[PDB]
Design a protein around this ligand. Sequence first.
Ligand SMILES: CC(=O)N[C@H]1[C@H](O[C@H]2[C@H]3C[C@H]4[C@@H]2OC(=O)[C@H]4C3)O[C@H](CO)[C@@H](O)[C@@H]1O
Length: 514
Amino acid sequence: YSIEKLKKEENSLAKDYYIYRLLEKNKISKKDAQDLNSHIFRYIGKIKSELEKIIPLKPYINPKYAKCYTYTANTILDANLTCQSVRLNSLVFIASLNSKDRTTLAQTFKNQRPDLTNLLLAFNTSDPMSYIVQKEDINGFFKLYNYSKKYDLDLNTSLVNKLPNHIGFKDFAQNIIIKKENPKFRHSMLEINPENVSEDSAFYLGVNALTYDKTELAYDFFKKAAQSFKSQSNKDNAIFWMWLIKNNEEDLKTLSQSSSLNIYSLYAKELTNTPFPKIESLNPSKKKNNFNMQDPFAWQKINKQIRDANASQLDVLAKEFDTQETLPIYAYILERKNNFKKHYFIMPYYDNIKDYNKTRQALILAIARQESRFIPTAISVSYALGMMQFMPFLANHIGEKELKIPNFDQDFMFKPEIAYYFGNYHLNYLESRLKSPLFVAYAYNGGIGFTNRMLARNDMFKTGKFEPFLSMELVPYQESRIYGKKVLANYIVYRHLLNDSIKISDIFENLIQN
Ligand SMILES: CC(=O)N[C@H]1[C@H](O[C@H]2[C@H]3C[C@H]4[C@@H]2OC(=O)[C@H]4C3)O[C@H](CO)[C@@H](O)[C@@H]1O
């Protein structure tokens, strides 16, 4: 489709994908690209940097403060007082000034903006973080952390307990704990009162406390996380820790009776001889309908209707799409429609995988459920394609160089036959090197480079009191940490449905290297 037909379609990730594809093939003229900013659902990342190679946009700065960016560190004392304050938002700017000008600007600002005063005087020292910490300036602490992550220093109880009141705190704690940077910051965060944190912050501080073997503080942190978490999956992750640390059976019972199906609730059910949860069964009699499951545009359309529906338009959609041909959509609508209380694990386009061994089938289906919910024409924000969410680099390399498919286009990933076959091929490569389906899941999402780098560390997936569950919490990419846990649960479930059950404790045992 030409840029002109693309312009007639609604903004969406599909449209973006296709505009990107013209860009990468250099088929968009400077003229085509004029009105094109209005035609991009999500102007971030690749399509942005690619369209800015044609029409650079170097904006934007408000007409108000335009005079203010005509001054440099050399001429800043000639600037009016508003301009002075604007430029001092940048800690790099402040670092650029000489110390005489910092002293002067610091006196100007001590009345109305002592935040500025403190940063100004801080950069007149060999250690700005220490100066800020001594003044207990919370806003300054975070501006310094964002400016430079290499500042590290011990923080007292008074101070650490103020940090969680700032929006930066969560990202700050997550980062330094899973990356294992700022050891003095980490050690100091052992004195945060659990009362003062909640949710993810509380959870990550529980993980922190485990790493220093402070199991009491860890429980309190995990407990506070259990009581505050919005989603049940996260509550469960926290209840599981509560149990592992103390071993109260009230905790494990709550976890075995969870409405959320996840690895922690599954493991707990196994440990308590609780029966496997009820998996729905969808077998629509209706054979097909009008809907083109191979049209990416139709999907994005119907996907917006499903998202933006009262739980009553849903029942109109559910019935419209209650067919064998639109089964993946049916299950998608149903999942939302029953408020995520029912467990849907379909096996669509099964003829394409029925001749693989059942353990392989489970792995493929588990990946596809998380990647796509089995939507053939699914496109991610990084433009990963189809049910198995292949990046176009990898899809083209497999399809052109390896499997030598004739007339291979990357849009072939929209075909179930192909998605499942390339999925099988790529998983074969990963399994043969990594073995565990959890490790395979990490590498399917984050690449095998990152996974091998992680497994080579001697603090990851080794033996230890709290292993392998602690390592699972310390996987360094957030997206991959979450992905693994989910795909693993999907794997258990699908092995079960396939009559190829495995104890999840068996999976956890083979995560440890001896
Ligand atoms: C289409 C899409 O955005 N897919 C992405 C996937 O997101 C799914 C999840 C979260 C949403 C999204 O599409 C769905 O149907 C739900 C299941 O997440 C993965 C990382 O975990 C991504 O690797 C994958 O590309």
